[PDB]
Paper text:
These states exhibit a relatively low overall resolution (4.6–7.4 Å) which is sufficient to trace CP maturation and the dissociation/recruitment of assembly factors and mitoribosomal proteins. Here, we observed four sub-states (A1-A4) with bound MRM3 dimer, which differ in (i) binding of uL16m (as A1/A3 mature to A2/A4) and bL36m (as A1/A2 mature into A3/A4) at the base of the L12 stalk and (ii) maturation status of the CP coupled with the dissociation of DDX28 (as A1/A2 mature to A3/A4). However, in states A2 and A4, the conformation of H89 correlated with the occupancy of uL16m, where H89 is lodged against uL16m proximal to a basic patch on its surface. It is thus likely that in the absence of uL16m (states A1/A3), H89 becomes disordered or displaced. Early states (A1–A4) exhibit an immature CP with MRM3 dimers bound to H92, poised to methylate G2482.
S-adenosylmethionine (SAM) is the principal methyl donor in cells and is essential for mitochondrial gene expression, influencing RNA modifications, translation, and ribosome biogenesis. Structural analysis by cryo-electron microscopy demonstrated that SAM-dependent methylation is required for peptidyl transferase centre formation during mitoribosome assembly. Our cryo-EM analysis of the mtLSU from SAM-depleted mitochondria reveals ten distinct assembly intermediates demonstrating how methylation can orchestrate mitoribosome maturation.
Residue numbers in the entry:
A (entry chain l): 58 to 133
B (entry chain r): 35 to 40, 47 to 196
C (entry chain J): 18 to 159
D (entry chain k): 13 to 56, 61 to 96
E (entry chain I): 41 to 76, 79 to 150, 155 to 200
Amino acid sequence: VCTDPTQLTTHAMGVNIYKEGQDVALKADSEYPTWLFQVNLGPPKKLEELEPESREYWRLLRKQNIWRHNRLSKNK
Amino acid sequence: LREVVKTVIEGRITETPKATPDPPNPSGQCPICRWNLKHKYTYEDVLLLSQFIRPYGGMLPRRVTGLCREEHRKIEECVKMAHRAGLLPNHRPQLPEGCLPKDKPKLNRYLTRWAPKSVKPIYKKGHRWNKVGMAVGSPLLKDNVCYSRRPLKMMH
Amino acid sequence: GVIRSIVRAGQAIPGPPLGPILGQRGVSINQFCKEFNEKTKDIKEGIPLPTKIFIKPDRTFELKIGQPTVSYFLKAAAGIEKGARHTGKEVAGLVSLKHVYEIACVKAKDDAFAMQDVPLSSVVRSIIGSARSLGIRVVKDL
Amino acid sequence: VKLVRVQFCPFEKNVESTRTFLQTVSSEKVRATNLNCSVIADVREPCVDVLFGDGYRLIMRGAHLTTQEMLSALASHIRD
Amino acid sequence: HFQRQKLMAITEYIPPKPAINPRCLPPPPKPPKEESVRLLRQDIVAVFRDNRMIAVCQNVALSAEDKLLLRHQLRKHKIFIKVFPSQVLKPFLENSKYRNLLPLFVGHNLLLVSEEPKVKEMVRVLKSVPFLPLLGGCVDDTILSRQGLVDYAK
RNA sequence: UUAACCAUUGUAGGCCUAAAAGCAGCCACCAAUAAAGAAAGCGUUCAAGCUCAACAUAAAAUCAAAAUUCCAUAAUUUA
Ligand code: FES
């Protein structure tokens, strides 16, 4: 497999590795839509980071609510 | 009130008789509150108790009655005492198909807090300082108005 | 009854982990491996694949397979075969952001795993979360 | 129970008892238990008819009947 | 001593009796209602406004992942399964374009939200499973039955 | 708080573990979804699997009065 930093950053080594599919080269950054590289790469959105008017905020809050019960349930 | 008629079976909801108009104390959340009857009913008051009891002596659900929990416990105890005292001849238990009662002499009892079946005899009465006390009445009815000089002797 | 296994296509008869477990419900062990071998030929051998076999009470096989795991690939991409004991804080490899997205695009092709979401935020979080499970730190650029 | 027929009219005044009862009939677990049943949502006052091969037919109207009573009556018929 | 025991009883505090017990009190004022749930209002408001006709079919214990696939399946049909908890569905009419659809939205049932008059696509969804009770689609945000939906889905 | 109902998909996630998949150890601890805890008690050749929390849908609101033979009798309301 590829072991070259230049090839790793200039060719899509991990896109396809099968025998029938050959490693395809990386197109220019402008050749892809902006949203491809603009996705959230940071840490998970915390309750502070999460927008109170976003669905993810309450969805993760419900997960946090489940966590509280689980913590209590574990001790029982 | 829903009744089922009977294979094809059909059920009809029928209108129910309404309470007498102009309750003595409107704005009362519970019917006992509405009628100023909080501390003036006893197990002897079968007429009031019968309204909340099934035809065979079963207790009606509290939600249907609408009365508060405190009265529910009091009314339930009062009804149970009346049944044990044989004050509800028309609300006796239902005979399933053809069963008949014990057909043995029935002892007259009243003011019975608990069922006679589950109360064991007190063989050792005790001495003056060790005398055993026998409960009479119900704690749920402590708040009822008393017309005696001193509170009634619950424990005999 | 849905039974999910991640066994590598290279070996179609591991034995205890697949054979008797499916057999306990009552199935033909040989039939399961043969169909698994059929999947093995299409895919590269020795790479874990998630399967979604459904063992109904009627003693039938409903084998469904999808894209190769991104958890093992991230380990391979990081040059790690056996990870650290904990992996919560231990890190042995770093994955560039560009590499992260390239694999995600191919991931969004199966009818299983919910690989039809238009936004790539869902896809990246799963692999980002998977990387956290592994002894790998996903750096934006290295 | 080979067939169960449940209907009600959402546009007109629709009784919840029959609607909730239909959902229980049209349940994956319930359908498996009475596998012989042929379920049909005749939603379109409410009339419910269940047909048996032996010729026993029970017709239930949910306008004055609660969902539980239909379930108890129909469920008892299943044992036969 | 007997006298000492008398003192202990005397220390007992004498409490006054309230006029009426809290349960038997006259109906008193209660804390004002607060919309906690507020986020979900925007989600339902946007989708209902976007989609004129909302086909309705009581969910037959469907699993969550299937809805994701069904969302994509409807995306093939150019429709979306945008549904949300029904506890906040009832206050939808309280704060939304309409206020009279509460009886229609009785119970928790699948909401199929479509903005385009692609009748064939909508029916095909109905062709997947008819056994679940399908109330009908509120064509142009108007109350319709199952048969009414057919009479007006055209 | 505490009464009814249900439980999808990623990832059997990395760890000496043959294998341990929420649930031997061990990890950090994210996603989609309307709602799913990278798991809370169960089950565990390992898993399948039982439920609790999820979502929907119920309905509530500060402690009391050992060996001879039981041992006054009784008793809840007229100021
Ligand atoms: S007398 Fe008013 S609630 Fe009981």
